[PDB]
Design an enzyme around this catalytic site. Sequence first.
Site, mmCIF file in Angstrom:
data_model
loop_
_atom_site.group_PDB
_atom_site.id
_atom_site.type_symbol
_atom_site.label_atom_id
_atom_site.label_comp_id
_atom_site.label_asym_id
_atom_site.label_seq_id
_atom_site.Cartn_x
_atom_site.Cartn_y
_atom_site.Cartn_z
ATOM 1 N N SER A 139 12.020 -103.931 7.266
ATOM 2 C CA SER A 139 12.886 -103.754 6.098
ATOM 3 C C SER A 139 12.524 -104.845 5.080
ATOM 4 O O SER A 139 11.387 -104.840 4.657
ATOM 5 C CB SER A 139 14.325 -103.711 6.501
ATOM 6 O OG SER A 139 15.079 -103.132 5.427
ATOM 7 N N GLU A 233 16.006 -91.725 6.422
ATOM 8 C CA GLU A 233 16.101 -93.056 5.775
ATOM 9 C C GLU A 233 16.118 -92.883 4.268
ATOM 10 O O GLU A 233 15.194 -92.246 3.720
ATOM 11 C CB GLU A 233 14.899 -93.940 6.101
ATOM 12 C CG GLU A 233 14.947 -94.523 7.474
ATOM 13 C CD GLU A 233 14.175 -95.833 7.581
ATOM 14 O OE1 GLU A 233 14.592 -96.803 6.908
ATOM 15 O OE2 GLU A 233 13.227 -95.888 8.378
ATOM 16 N N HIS A 263 16.843 -96.141 10.077
ATOM 17 C CA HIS A 263 16.364 -97.476 9.654
ATOM 18 C C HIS A 263 16.147 -98.388 10.861
ATOM 19 O O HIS A 263 17.078 -98.599 11.641
ATOM 20 C CB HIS A 263 17.345 -98.090 8.664
ATOM 21 C CG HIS A 263 16.772 -99.260 7.949
ATOM 22 N ND1 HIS A 263 15.615 -99.162 7.242
ATOM 23 C CD2 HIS A 263 17.224 -100.524 7.782
ATOM 24 C CE1 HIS A 263 15.349 -100.337 6.673
ATOM 25 N NE2 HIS A 263 16.337 -101.175 6.955
#
Length: 291
Positions: A139, A233, A263
Amino acid sequence: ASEALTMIVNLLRSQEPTVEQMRAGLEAMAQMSPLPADVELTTVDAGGVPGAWVRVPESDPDRVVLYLHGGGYVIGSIRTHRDLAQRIARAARCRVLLIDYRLAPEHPHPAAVEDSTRAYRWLLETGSDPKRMAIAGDSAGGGLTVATLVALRDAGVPLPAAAVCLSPWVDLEGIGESMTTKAAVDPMVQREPLLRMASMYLAGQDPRTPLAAPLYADLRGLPPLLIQVGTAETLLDDSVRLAERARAAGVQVTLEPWEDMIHVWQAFAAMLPEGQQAIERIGEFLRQHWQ
Ligand SMILES: O=C(O)c1ccccc1C1c2ccc(O)cc2Oc2cc(O)ccc21
Ligand SMILES: O=C(O)c1ccccc1C1c2ccc(O)cc2Oc2cc(O)ccc21
């Protein structure tokens, strides 16, 4: 997908929290991951950045992943991502260096990139060979991975053998199509909390600042890139646009969209089969590029 995905989605569905509450909440969630007894943790000063070595029995000691944790550049720690780090160490048969890079809003961009590049330079200084190294992150950490490679390249530092982005965040404006079209099926990431964390990281800087938002960075000469992303996502189009940019820059990209995954589904590997399968793939990718 596996029935186990529903268990994870239910955990996620059950929750304006302050930064301190978000940090403590993630640290609390991480307590639930038992660290296996064969994992050796060593805290280290990684050239002025706090770090921890993560080693498991079949860790080739000369192979190193510099791991950059997610958390929107605002939360997360060596502790929150220690389980993901030991699972990668096991699959890639390497050591992992986790770093506590400076977090926003206390330490805005570019503090995270200064810390990641400093830790990488420290690995070189202390004898690590780039041909046996990789940078990986999830991320925000996946975006930090790409920014770290760009910054190292620009400074004439030798680049590692490979890099791995798990659901990377590279667009701090949230203008990917998936930010709208996957909002309904994403139980973790929405535009509003992303923009709040982008605001804390940027501290008024241009949201297209290349080392903050590497969708706008020059990616020429980066080493082979594995991008893993879930089709459920809002950040799907961050991985798609990153793959497009890197390939147009001549980078060898493997883009792996995992059907229905959420995610950083790899983080749920203890209970989510696709999580452990995705980590096994990371291991195979890294061992391929280290051959
Ligand atoms: O998870 C642990 O290792 C642990 C063990 C005993 C007491 C407390 C903890 C921790 C802990 C437990 C509850 C919680 O809400 C969060 C939490 O966070 C940490 C953070 C650490 O760096 C280090 C340790 C902990
Ligand atoms: O939601 C946003 O777009 C945003 C952007 C920057 C900073 C903060 C936010 C907001 C925000 C962040 C996450 C969250 O959990 C709640 C939240 O709520 C709002 C509400 C607003 O009226 C207006 C803005 C926000």
